[PDB]
């Protein structure tokens, strides 16, 4: 049963990236102001915060097995900090343009970064953060990168060039390119995490969300309802729902069977930019970042 409860919301400068820690009740936010914050959303106290740079930090993830966060900013740099001490672990120029998205491999010491420089790059932290591969082919800003959780030797990139490309580590060309028909670009791409469907989902400035079968490359459904740019759309890892957020200021919860909207929320923080779901579905927690702060919600 739905029953959405606000577990914790706080105001801040624009939140561009957001992520849950898998074992600690923490959420990381990365802000347009160059600040990043880690909050305990149950006690409502900051565990750690850092003024990383003066430029926007659009991407941030926990690397829990190393006790790190990894962040990427408009100053072209990837930085890694230990969240127990605040100490900076590494600081390098990753791309000659904005970093939009960072993905962390579940079992290997690999991170992917997607950039306005039209590429995705693969970095190996057990090889001194060496650049091990650059994936070329996209023709506009790479807005989102995500590993296939069912096979993380592959990953998807979503791009303003209106395509999603799916790649294999160690190979220079896409396994396939998905022509989305979302003519104003792809802002976000996500995988359905369960084994029963080979699904991906894309979000666009053209106000649509689309579901794809990655075996046949077919569009399964198109979700309409948002009134401004759709910033993200994701499958919930345990509940039969899709969650999206938009510059129209709303989050929408969609039935993942019928593809109909179940609930629209305006949490009152203006434009929505980013989303996270708790890795193990603890308390069905989700979190989203907005122009004016973030909110952590329990869905039921």
């Amino acid at each position: 049963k739905l029953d959405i409860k606000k577990t914790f919301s706080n105001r801040s400068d624009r939140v561009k990236g957001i992520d849950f820690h898998p074992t600690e009740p923490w959420v990381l936010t990365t802000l347009y102001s160059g600040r990043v914050e880690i909050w305990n959303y149950e006690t409502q106290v900051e565990v750690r915060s850092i003024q990383v740079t003066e430029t926007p930090v659009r991407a941030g993830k926990f690397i829990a097995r190393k006790n790190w966060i990894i962040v990427g900013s408009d100053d072209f740099r990837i930085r890694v900090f230990n969240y127990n001490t605040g100490e900076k672990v590494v600081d390098f120029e990753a791309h000659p343009d904005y970093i939009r998205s960072i993905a962390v491999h579940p079992t290997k010491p690999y991170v992917l970064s997607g950039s306005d420089d039209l590429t995705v790059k693969l970095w190996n932290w057990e090889n001194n953060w060496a650049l091990e591969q650059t994936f070329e082919g996209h023709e506009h800003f790479v807005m989102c990168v995500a590993f296939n959780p069912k096979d993380p030797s592959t990953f998807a990139s979503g791009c303003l060039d209106r395509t999603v490309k799916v790649w294999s580590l160690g190979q220079s060309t896409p396994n396939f390119t998905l022509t989305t028909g979302q003519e104003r670009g792809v802002n976000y791409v996500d995988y359905y995490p369960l084994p029963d469907k080979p699904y991906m989902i894309t979000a666009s400035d053209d106000l649509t969300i689309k579901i794809w079968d990655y075996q046949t490359k077919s569009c399964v459904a198109t979700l309409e309802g948002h009134m401004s740019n759709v910033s993200f759309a994701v499958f919930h890892p345990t509940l039969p729902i899709i969650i999206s957020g938009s510059e129209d200021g709303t989050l929408k919860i969609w039935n993942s069977s019928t593809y109909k909207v179940e609930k629209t929320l305006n949490v009152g923080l203006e434009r929505s930019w980013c989303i996270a779901t708790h890795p193990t579905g603890r308390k069905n927690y989700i979190a989203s970042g907005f122009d004016n702060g973030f909110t952590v919600l329990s869905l039921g």
């Binding site: 347009y32 904005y98 306005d116 807005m143 303003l160 434009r271």
Partner: peptide
């Protein structure tokens, strides 16, 4: 630049 915000 697109998506500057």
């Amino acid at each position: 630049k697109p998506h500057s915000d």
